[PDB]
Amino acid sequence: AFHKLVKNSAYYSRFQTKF
Amino acid sequence: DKILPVLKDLKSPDAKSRTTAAGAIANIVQDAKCRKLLLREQVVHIVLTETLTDNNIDSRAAGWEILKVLAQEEEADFCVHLYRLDVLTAIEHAAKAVLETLTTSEPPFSKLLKAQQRLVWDITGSLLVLIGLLALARDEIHEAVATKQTILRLLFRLISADIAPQDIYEEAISCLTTLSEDNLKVGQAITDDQETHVYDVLLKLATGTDPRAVMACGVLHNVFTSLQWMDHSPGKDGACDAILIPTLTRALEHVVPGGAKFNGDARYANITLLALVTLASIGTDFQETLVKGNQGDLEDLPTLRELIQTAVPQLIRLSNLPIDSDESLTIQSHALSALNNISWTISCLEFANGENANIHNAWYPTAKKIWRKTILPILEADSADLKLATQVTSLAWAVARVLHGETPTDGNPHRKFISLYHSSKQDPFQGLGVKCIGVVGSLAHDPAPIEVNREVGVFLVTLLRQSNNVPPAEIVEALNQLFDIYGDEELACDKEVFWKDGFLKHLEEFLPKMRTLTKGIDKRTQPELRTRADEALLNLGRFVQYKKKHA
């Protein structure tokens, strides 16, 4: 259940397109 | 001057005349202007205080529509004014009557008069629409509505029984979709209902052959996220986004080029657009499974498995096809949004060294297809959109963060993204320029063609030499891309390009320039960019030493 994330993942949440 | 005397009647002590006036004002409040005058004379006040609690059910149906119509024709705020006037209680009390009528066995619903029945639906329709509107108004109104058990239980009763007219059914789903969007209480309400079993009814319908299957998916997805029914922590019977994906995908299977509209089409807003938007949300929210999973052959990640194997193939199809018409112009766009969200989330995983190998083999070939079949054709016809240009670069950047110079070099895409940057010159990190830097930077890592690397590297460094007018975020990205590329002396490009073209001098020259622009950023407005830039200068200084030490 542990999958290593990128060093600064939250930086990339802005590129999600929301609805 | 016509409406003035109509309103007097609404307060008339003769139930017959009031109940008639109500009828007329519901029509008259439709056209603008007659509505300005009707609102100034105290229509909203009478309807709320007299007409909605009148004894005659024709009066109350007009009352509700006068409010319904007003709520629709008015700006969003008009609803807050309604909220403040306590419309929600009026709605809750009326809601409790629909249920008594619908669930009574004394009179009892199916044995009502045809016209009597149609009226109960009128009132429900007005209620449903109103609740929908106020819930969209503000967070407090949303959480006030969601509090009201009568409102909720009305919704479960309608969706569950499926006896309502379809326009009422769909409005009720619509409502519950909005109410259930990121709202824990509602999700618990839906899954905790042993009275009507809305959750079971929703599941069955979201999985089967019914035409409204996708509509139920939109509700269920909202429930799965809010309750954290995810891959690490599946919900009732292993439930999580995984089970919604095939239904959502079979919905894209049916849309084929050349049939935009028909004489009778009850599915287009719901059938196609809803499926895409929900797939793309599923793309977004899977990111939270990765984070929460950590605080505690993609067999263990069925949501991700389904996304890649099933969801993504149909989205590459849809991205491809014209585009003959504006409507399919929107299908493309939404298809690209989903690809984007999925690709981005996936690229939020560490794949360096051996890390996450299982998921990397699952994804890599698909990532290559997305690039060849989607990103590349679209990049082939330069003209003309900025909105669309921006969408394809975002996706390309997400796919090349995994590919890393393994990414296809075919139409020499880097040159197109590079020209995109300069030409589109005419929240700091959401600039399209940042996107151009990041993709081109990402596909230039080793083992890419040494000349493709030379161009990209030259562009990145030129950016610094002429930093005089580059937006600070774009400087940070450039510096991170460079560090990411030329920080390994074993890679041909380190000697073949970094040294051959003396990138080191520009970097040593840029160090002073980079210190003043960093201190030029208001830590207090806004923090992130500042602290991010501080790390880049830090890294820039450490980077100028390490090589300095290597021929």
UniProtKB/Swiss-Prot annotation, chain A:
Top-level taxon of the source organism: Eukaryota
Organism: Chaetomium thermophilum (strain DSM 1495 / CBS 144.50 / IMI 039719)
Transmembrane segments: none
Subcellular location field: Cytoplasm
Name of the protein: Large ribosomal subunit protein uL18
The protein's role, per its UniProt record: Component of the ribosome, a large ribonucleoprotein complex responsible for the synthesis of proteins in the cell. The small ribosomal subunit (SSU) binds messenger RNAs (mRNAs) and translates the encoded message by selecting cognate aminoacyl-transfer RNA (tRNA) molecules. The large subunit (LSU) contains the ribosomal catalytic site termed the peptidyl transferase center (PTC), which catalyzes the formation of peptide bonds, thereby polymerizing the amino acids delivered by tRNAs into a polypeptide chain.
Record note on quaternary structure: Component of a hexameric 5S RNP precursor complex, composed of 5S RNA, RRS1, RPF2, RPL5, RPL11 and SYO1; this complex acts as a precursor for ribosome assembly.
Family from the record: Belongs to the universal ribosomal protein uL18 family.
Lineage of the species this protein comes from: Eukaryota, Fungi, Dikarya, Ascomycota, Pezizomycotina
From Swiss-Prot, chain B:
GO biological process entries: protein import into nucleus; ribosomal large subunit biogenesis
Keywords, comma-separated and alphabetical: Repeat
Record-level Gene Ontology MF annotations: unfolded protein binding
Extent of the ARM repeats: 150-183, 310-343
Entry coiled-coil feature ranges: none
Tree of life domain: Eukaryota
Family: Belongs to the nuclear import and ribosome assembly adapter family.
Summary of subunit composition and partner proteins: Component of a hexameric 5S RNP precursor complex, composed of 5S RNA, RRS1, RPF2, RPL5, RPL11 and SYO1; this complex acts as a precursor for ribosome assembly.
Function according to Swiss-Prot or TrEMBL: Involved in ribosomal large subunit assembly.
Name listed for the protein in its UniProt record: Symportin 1
Native species: Chaetomium thermophilum (strain DSM 1495 / CBS 144.50 / IMI 039719)
